[PDB]
Design a protein around this ligand. Sequence first.
Ligand SMILES: *[C@@H](C)[C@H]1/C(=C/C2=NC(=C\c3[nH]c(C[C@H]4NC(=O)C(C=C)=C4C)c(C)c3CCC(=O)O)/C(CCC(=O)O)=C2C)NC(=O)[C@@H]1C
Ligand SMILES: *[C@@H](C)[C@H]1/C(=C/C2=NC(=C\c3[nH]c(C[C@H]4NC(=O)C(C=C)=C4C)c(C)c3CCC(=O)O)/C(CCC(=O)O)=C2C)NC(=O)[C@@H]1C
Ligand SMILES: *[C@@H](C)[C@H]1/C(=C/C2=NC(=C\c3[nH]c(C[C@H]4NC(=O)C(C=C)=C4C)c(C)c3CCC(=O)O)/C(CCC(=O)O)=C2C)NC(=O)[C@@H]1C
Ligand SMILES: *[C@H](C)[C@H]1/C(=C/C2=NC(=C\c3[nH]c(C[C@H]4NC(=O)C(C=C)=C4C)c(C)c3CCC(=O)O)/C(CCC(=O)O)=C2C)NC(=O)[C@@H]1C
Ligand SMILES: C=CC1=C(C)[C@@H](Cc2[nH]c(/C=C3N=C(/C=C4\NC(=O)[C@H](C)[C@H]4CC)C(C)=C\3CCC(=O)O)c(CCC(=O)O)c2C)NC1=O
Ligand SMILES: C=CC1=C(C)[C@@H](Cc2[nH]c(/C=C3N=C(/C=C4\NC(=O)[C@H](C)[C@H]4CC)C(C)=C\3CCC(=O)O)c(CCC(=O)O)c2C)NC1=O
Ligand SMILES: C=CC1=C(C)[C@@H](Cc2[nH]c(/C=C3N=C(/C=C4\NC(=O)[C@H](C)[C@H]4CC)C(C)=C\3CCC(=O)O)c(CCC(=O)O)c2C)NC1=O
Ligand SMILES: C=CC1=C(C)[C@@H](Cc2[nH]c(/C=C3N=C(/C=C4\NC(=O)[C@H](C)[C@H]4CC)C(C)=C\3CCC(=O)O)c(CCC(=O)O)c2C)NC1=O
Ligand SMILES: C=CC1=C(C)[C@@H](Cc2[nH]c(/C=C3N=C(/C=C4\NC(=O)[C@H](C)[C@H]4CC)C(C)=C\3CCC(=O)O)c(CCC(=O)O)c2C)NC1=O
Ligand SMILES: C=CC1=C(C)[C@@H](Cc2[nH]c(/C=C3N=C(/C=C4\NC(=O)[C@H](C)[C@H]4CC)C(C)=C\3CCC(=O)O)c(CCC(=O)O)c2C)NC1=O
Ligand SMILES: CCC1=C(C)[C@@H](CC2=N/C(=C\c3[nH]c(C[C@@H]4NC(=O)C(C)=C4CC)c(C)c3CCC(=O)O)C(CCC(=O)O)=C2C)NC1=O
Ligand SMILES: CCC1=C(C)[C@@H](CC2=N/C(=C\c3[nH]c(C[C@@H]4NC(=O)C(C)=C4CC)c(C)c3CCC(=O)O)C(CCC(=O)O)=C2C)NC1=O
Ligand SMILES: CCC1=C(C)[C@@H](CC2=N/C(=C\c3[nH]c(C[C@@H]4NC(=O)C(C)=C4CC)c(C)c3CCC(=O)O)C(CCC(=O)O)=C2C)NC1=O
Lengths: 164, 164, 164, 225, 176, 176, 176
Amino acid sequence: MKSVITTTISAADAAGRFPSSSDLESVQGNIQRAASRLEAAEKLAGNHEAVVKEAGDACFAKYPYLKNPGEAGDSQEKINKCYRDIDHYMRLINYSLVVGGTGPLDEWGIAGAREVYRALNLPGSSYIAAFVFTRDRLCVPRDMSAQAAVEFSGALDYVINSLC
Amino acid sequence: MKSVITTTISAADAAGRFPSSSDLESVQGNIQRAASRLEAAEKLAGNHEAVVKEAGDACFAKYPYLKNPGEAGDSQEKINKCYRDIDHYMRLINYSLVVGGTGPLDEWGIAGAREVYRALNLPGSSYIAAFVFTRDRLCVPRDMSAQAAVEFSGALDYVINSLC
Amino acid sequence: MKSVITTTISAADAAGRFPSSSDLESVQGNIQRAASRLEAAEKLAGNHEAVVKEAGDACFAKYPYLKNPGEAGDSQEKINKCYRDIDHYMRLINYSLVVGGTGPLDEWGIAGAREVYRALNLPGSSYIAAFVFTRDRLCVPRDMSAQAAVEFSGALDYVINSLC
Amino acid sequence: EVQLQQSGAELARPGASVKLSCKASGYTFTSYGISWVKQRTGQGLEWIGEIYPRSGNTYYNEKFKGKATLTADKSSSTAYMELRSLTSEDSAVYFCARQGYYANSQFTYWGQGTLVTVSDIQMTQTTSSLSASLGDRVTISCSASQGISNYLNWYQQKPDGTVKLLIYYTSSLHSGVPSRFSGSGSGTDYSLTISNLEPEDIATYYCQQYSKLPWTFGGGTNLEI
Amino acid sequence: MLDAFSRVVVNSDSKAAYVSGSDLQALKTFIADGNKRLDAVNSIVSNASCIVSDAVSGMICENPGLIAPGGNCYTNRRMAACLRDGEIILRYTSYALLAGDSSVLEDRCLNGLKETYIALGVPTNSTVRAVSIMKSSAVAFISNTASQRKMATADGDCSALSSEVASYCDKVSAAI
Amino acid sequence: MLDAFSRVVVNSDSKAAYVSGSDLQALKTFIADGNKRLDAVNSIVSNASCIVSDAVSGMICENPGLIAPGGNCYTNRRMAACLRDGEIILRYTSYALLAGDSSVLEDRCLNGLKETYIALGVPTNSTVRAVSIMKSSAVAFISNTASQRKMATADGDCSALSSEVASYCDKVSAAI
Amino acid sequence: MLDAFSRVVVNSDSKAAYVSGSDLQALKTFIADGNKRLDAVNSIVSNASCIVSDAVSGMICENPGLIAPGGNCYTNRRMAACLRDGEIILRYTSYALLAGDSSVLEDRCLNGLKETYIALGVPTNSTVRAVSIMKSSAVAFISNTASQRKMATADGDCSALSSEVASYCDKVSAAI
Ligand SMILES: *[C@@H](C)[C@H]1/C(=C/C2=NC(=C\c3[nH]c(C[C@H]4NC(=O)C(C=C)=C4C)c(C)c3CCC(=O)O)/C(CCC(=O)O)=C2C)NC(=O)[C@@H]1C
Ligand SMILES: *[C@@H](C)[C@H]1/C(=C/C2=NC(=C\c3[nH]c(C[C@H]4NC(=O)C(C=C)=C4C)c(C)c3CCC(=O)O)/C(CCC(=O)O)=C2C)NC(=O)[C@@H]1C
Ligand SMILES: *[C@@H](C)[C@H]1/C(=C/C2=NC(=C\c3[nH]c(C[C@H]4NC(=O)C(C=C)=C4C)c(C)c3CCC(=O)O)/C(CCC(=O)O)=C2C)NC(=O)[C@@H]1C
Ligand SMILES: *[C@H](C)[C@H]1/C(=C/C2=NC(=C\c3[nH]c(C[C@H]4NC(=O)C(C=C)=C4C)c(C)c3CCC(=O)O)/C(CCC(=O)O)=C2C)NC(=O)[C@@H]1C
Ligand SMILES: C=CC1=C(C)[C@@H](Cc2[nH]c(/C=C3N=C(/C=C4\NC(=O)[C@H](C)[C@H]4CC)C(C)=C\3CCC(=O)O)c(CCC(=O)O)c2C)NC1=O
Ligand SMILES: C=CC1=C(C)[C@@H](Cc2[nH]c(/C=C3N=C(/C=C4\NC(=O)[C@H](C)[C@H]4CC)C(C)=C\3CCC(=O)O)c(CCC(=O)O)c2C)NC1=O
Ligand SMILES: C=CC1=C(C)[C@@H](Cc2[nH]c(/C=C3N=C(/C=C4\NC(=O)[C@H](C)[C@H]4CC)C(C)=C\3CCC(=O)O)c(CCC(=O)O)c2C)NC1=O
Ligand SMILES: C=CC1=C(C)[C@@H](Cc2[nH]c(/C=C3N=C(/C=C4\NC(=O)[C@H](C)[C@H]4CC)C(C)=C\3CCC(=O)O)c(CCC(=O)O)c2C)NC1=O
Ligand SMILES: C=CC1=C(C)[C@@H](Cc2[nH]c(/C=C3N=C(/C=C4\NC(=O)[C@H](C)[C@H]4CC)C(C)=C\3CCC(=O)O)c(CCC(=O)O)c2C)NC1=O
Ligand SMILES: C=CC1=C(C)[C@@H](Cc2[nH]c(/C=C3N=C(/C=C4\NC(=O)[C@H](C)[C@H]4CC)C(C)=C\3CCC(=O)O)c(CCC(=O)O)c2C)NC1=O
Ligand SMILES: CCC1=C(C)[C@@H](CC2=N/C(=C\c3[nH]c(C[C@@H]4NC(=O)C(C)=C4CC)c(C)c3CCC(=O)O)C(CCC(=O)O)=C2C)NC1=O
Ligand SMILES: CCC1=C(C)[C@@H](CC2=N/C(=C\c3[nH]c(C[C@@H]4NC(=O)C(C)=C4CC)c(C)c3CCC(=O)O)C(CCC(=O)O)=C2C)NC1=O
Ligand SMILES: CCC1=C(C)[C@@H](CC2=N/C(=C\c3[nH]c(C[C@@H]4NC(=O)C(C)=C4CC)c(C)c3CCC(=O)O)C(CCC(=O)O)=C2C)NC1=O
């Protein structure tokens, strides 16, 4: 997974270098931003059921045509799969906050999402609606601290831009 | 110029990626360790004449054979070159402390030093003696703070290991 | 520009071969199927205004949410651009029927359509609705001969599968 | 502005041919089509056919196929209707109208009208004549044989004979139409509402579907005060 | 590539000088504004998609000849290439903003970009118009003055970072 | 590369026009003469070795300095390269004849051929002489007027294909 | 590769579970000891040359047959390769120590290392002896118990990082 540690160790290994002052400095940044990103991860992990339910409700409210026959979510099982997909993305965002990098998202939700959603007629706009609602729904300091919100919204914007 | 920022941005560019959370987090580490490494750079920059003089004196004290004809330092011009080389290395170490990485050292003192010193019969062990003396001469907190000393000694150890 | 002639000439050139029996035979296939595909092209070229209008109307009827603010086609100019896009695709299909290969479509409508439509929030399902309606709207022998219909529906299915 | 000047009234004999003309000005000729509408004496409008000069493509009402031939001249920015085998049934006033392409498929601007002497969606205007007074709010309603998708245009035909596009897409006002006019309808039933009637509104009003070819007009409702 | 710190040391190396106290103080100012710089980069990257798409759309809307036949944004392939170039330019501008130095942008995106665009027939005027729309949008996002989206940050002055983003985009426009 | 149909399409695409009735009729004429075009290509390819060898030999016979020391056909290596270049030019001319369009020949053989020959010292005059002898022999084979080789075809007029072959060879000569 | 955080994430992903409070607390402990981990990595890398040279020299001194003819450290080339991959093993061990996870070491150094050494004739016993001397020296440097080199650190207990270094070296030895 992409992260501060993996990025700098990969750069060191590509050059065949022992970890130098720059790599230790980047890991110090890991240490510094860990508080905020792990607070965001803890809040998301402890509240993901409600967050995913709200995101999916917003997705289907913005795009009621998804319920129409032949569309994604025209059956109850497909709606459950939509909420499960939002759960998967929220869990990958929790993983990204824990890791400190987009690696979990990149490798487990984004890498082939374009082809999967094209093959299964899943419009990326619905996922974008769920994630945009999740990002806008978060408020500070009620849900998390300001920097935890920064990290959480950064991961949400990352997945949104992966879908855009 | 290897640094936290340059390593991070080069890794992002190699993957065609916008700066991500881990990129900003590495730069946060730059911010966190900058105080110590810039304190070390300021102390070295403000005291480099005496430090270089001491390092060169230690190099020639440990290897008086360098004064023998045909050896490096058999003339006053060559001894001045020796001290100028130690000044070059200390300036590159000051640059590395300012940059936050070994980039300046790698590109300006290390990259071809092996071939240069082989061609000119310059024993790397004399440079190592100067840098080891400088590293062991530093006193905390008399000369600099503990973490500034850590950064300075890390740069010196990097030079020594480049010559080993 | 992918076609029978260009494909076999490219294969001959890659092997540094003069045209041989196989290449002339494939061009004979060009000669044989040209009647049907050029009939389809003539019918489409002489009736593209009505066909494009019907396809766009079907697209917006199947997806009325496109008229909602923030969606593609929430302004009259964007609706005109949707019909213009269907015009572009129908013209590229006319080009493919004339050429006898998907080359015009591949190079001018398909090559970057994924990234363009992702960037501009243009759901591929709307284009697919327009083209599926056009394919199902065609009647034999009312609008085309059977083989002309085969070629026209083949081009339409090709663009649909490029969007799927 | 858009004018679409038509040729003068031409008199012919049964079995002869008449080449009607329509010179377009004020707009790019190839950015629009040219539709031709037949109106018999005291009858409703009837779409003959449309030609798009950009491609030269012609679309004809099946009732006028071979009877009418549409050609256009991009150099002179003019369009021609050629009537063949003229009869008493062809005695009518023929209009040329600027036709939009895809979603703007509206007869936005009409010609003055050239008089000539000797599965379709049925558009029904139930009330063929309505009488009202100044300042009244009159409602003109028409029904489509099959469901259309709000693709309805309303046309004001003055007693002078000139035809103007009032409302397109069932609700959108034309460039010069005052807010007193309004339209409504979603399925098969559509209504044209004129609030605070004025003497300039004394005209015959036609609803025209452009959901499916051939384009069809309603019978028309004459509004008198 | 160089960052602000490496730029300072390169300037210092031209005179064989240890990094001076004034240059050190400028770098401490860079560090003290480091959190604001990270917020600025985050503002750009979190809105990079709409920045690039809006810039290309505005360039095309102001210059409809680009999407006409023979225009450089005509086909879907050319439009995708234009959007990709806008994304690449914004990515390197964000690299410069993160680094505090334009060396990455110049060396890895602008070196030969003008000649490449001339060879490809990419209109320089439209390219700089798109780059200027990206500049305006990115500056608004740094200043949190974007009309349709706001990013929560501690209140303060990021005008130095706005000017830095504008200067990077100006380097892009002047290079081509 | 483009063929005749793709050439018509590219011309139509410049105006965002569907392929018009006149261009359609021209392509239908191309199809109706398709069997004659295949016969012409077959005539060229079935005699390609003889065409190329005869052209290079005639170029050398009319310019004996080519095989003298310092001449560009002097050694066996230079002779083989010259015969290979003649074969390549004839092959791309036959590609153009089969395609009905010069795009393949231009882009894949004539692009940079003049500059390459200048850099190599290949004499342009002798190259065009060889290409013109190839043109004459290939035209004769199209018309079945070759003295020592006749190929059976249905009686008819292939002057259009002969003129196409001549025009492709003329494009080759004018490129260098 | 994986770090400690990505390792926790991968373990959580096996159950489709969000990172639980226990794993979160373990990662905060990893963060709370992050400065000690950086000091440990710094101690190893600042003495990497001495660690590797001392380990290879001790392996040779305890097994003099390595430098005899037919021994795997016989020539200067074999000696250089032995020192080089001792440095490589120490570098990947330091990578694991920095990452907090063995994934980088396993995947990028230990994958196929045993088979490669078997194919080359590199004696596994001597390799593990060198790796164990590196383990001892690196552990001493982590604990700042090296006799001839002391590095200033805040007083405390780095036994967890020392055990991590020992476990990475043990993974190296067990792989071969
Ligand atoms: C212009 C860019 C903005 C703006 C920026 C400010 N934010 C300030 C403080 C601040 N921001 C962060 C987050 C930032 N640093 C990081 O470590 C990362 C990610 C790795 C990011 C994205 C932090 C941690 C802080 C420090 C205190 C806090 O938590 O808020 C700030 C105050 C000055 C400063 O402390 O640097 C400003 C002005 N705010 C604006 O007004 C515009 C829109
Ligand atoms: C100038 C090139 C010639 C010439 C050509 C003609 N051949 C005619 C007809 C014709 N040729 C073929 C063979 C051709 N088509 C193929 O399928 C292939 C290979 C795959 C080849 C080589 C066919 C099948 C036909 C049609 C029926 C037949 O005659 O066998 C032809 C008549 C016009 C036409 O049908 O296109 C002509 C004039 N004949 C000449 O006089 C010169 C030397
Ligand atoms: C075992 C490895 C050592 C040891 C480690 C400890 N050092 C402690 C604190 C500490 N160390 C650093 C430097 C470290 N962090 C960085 O930012 C970098 C480089 C980028 C390095 C090399 C810092 C900043 C700190 C915190 C403040 C300070 O003391 O300077 C420490 C205390 C616990 C902790 O803070 O993590 C210990 C025990 N000391 C030992 O006894 C052995 C030999
Ligand atoms: C089987 C009998 C049909 C059917 C016939 C109808 N289609 C009608 C007209 C119509 N068809 C198209 C599309 C079709 N015509 C073309 O020229 C081409 C080829 C490029 C295609 C794909 C259009 C655009 C139209 C409108 C008028 C025209 O331009 O021809 C039609 C007339 C009434 C109407 O337009 O709704 C009918 C009833 N009936 C069926 O349900 C199947 C599909
Ligand atoms: C950890 C990785 C992971 C993800 C990131 C998601 C992504 C994902 N979604 C689907 C697949 C699906 N996803 C949806 C859900 C949706 N329907 C709607 O109304 C919307 C458009 C959309 C959510 C917004 C549907 C309906 C399917 C089933 C379609 C099918 O498999 O044929 C699939 C195919 C596998 C399957 O059958 O489930 C995958 C991999 N799922 C994963 O396992
Ligand atoms: C910024 C880059 C940079 C460096 C890092 C140094 C590196 C360096 N050193 C020397 C060259 C030299 N350096 C020394 C110095 C020494 N004599 C001793 O007693 C020791 C072995 C050694 C220092 C410990 C001497 C004596 C020479 C002269 C060449 C020679 O000895 O033949 C030269 C060649 C040019 C010259 O003659 O000065 C260079 C490039 N110089 C630079 O400009
Ligand atoms: C010859 C090549 C060629 C094509 C094949 C199409 C493809 C295409 N479409 C658009 C661009 C567009 N196309 C549409 C049309 C649509 N809106 C809707 O209601 C639907 C979802 C969709 C058709 C079904 C719209 C609205 C835009 C602009 C998007 C925006 O708002 O930025 C663009 C960008 C250039 C531009 O600004 O026009 C391109 C290249 N156009 C071409 O020039
Ligand atoms: C790191 C540096 C870097 C860049 C900045 C670009 C530079 C670049 N641009 C193009 C290629 C291109 N450049 C554009 C883009 C544009 N045409 C327009 O209408 C706009 C004005 C403009 C963007 C604003 C287009 C459309 C092409 C293709 C040329 C054509 O087909 O006409 C290409 C060739 C193929 C490609 O990779 O896209 C390259 C290398 N890419 C890079 O890797
Ligand atoms: C697709 C395009 C294409 C071509 C047409 C040629 C183009 C070409 N020709 C030559 C190379 C050459 N070109 C020739 C040929 C000639 N010298 C003569 O005396 C004649 C006038 C003339 C042919 C009629 C010779 C002899 C050389 C070698 C140059 C020399 O040794 O002087 C070379 C360099 C490598 C090589 O030897 O092949 C190339 C790339 N090859 C291709 O792939
Ligand atoms: C990332 C993984 C990685 C490593 C760990 C090494 C692994 C490795 N080592 C050797 C190569 C070798 N390995 C050694 C080293 C040794 N000889 C001894 O006496 C000791 C027991 C032992 C180390 C302690 C020697 C001497 C050879 C060459 C074998 C020979 O010449 O007999 C080779 C073959 C090519 C080369 O020289 O690089 C490889 C791939 N390299 C890597 O890139
Ligand atoms: C239909 C073709 C079309 C467009 C697309 C726009 C393109 C456009 N938007 C701009 C400017 C612009 N655009 C955005 C982005 C956008 N605005 C927001 O407030 C947010 C969050 C957005 C989500 C999409 C921003 C942030 C700005 C900067 C000013 C602003 O805050 O709006 C500018 C001015 C830049 C300049 O002059 O250099 C233009 C031309 N105009 C058009 O006619
Ligand atoms: C000894 C050096 C030498 C040669 C070799 C020739 C080369 C040569 N042959 C020609 C012309 C030429 N050459 C051929 C090919 C050839 N002829 C046939 O009739 C058949 C079937 C052939 C099998 C080899 C053809 C078909 C022509 C066209 C007219 C002809 O039939 O002669 C031409 C005229 C082309 C022009 O002027 O552009 C020349 C110069 N002459 C020489 O002095
Ligand atoms: C002549 C062939 C030769 C050698 C070389 C050594 C090799 C050697 N040194 C060791 C052990 C060892 N070696 C070092 C490194 C070294 N010692 C220091 O104290 C410092 C700072 C050093 C700089 C060079 C350290 C740090 C240790 C760990 C214990 C110690 O502090 O000495 C060990 C024990 C490791 C084990 O058993 O696994 C050995 C065998 N012995 C030999 O016979």
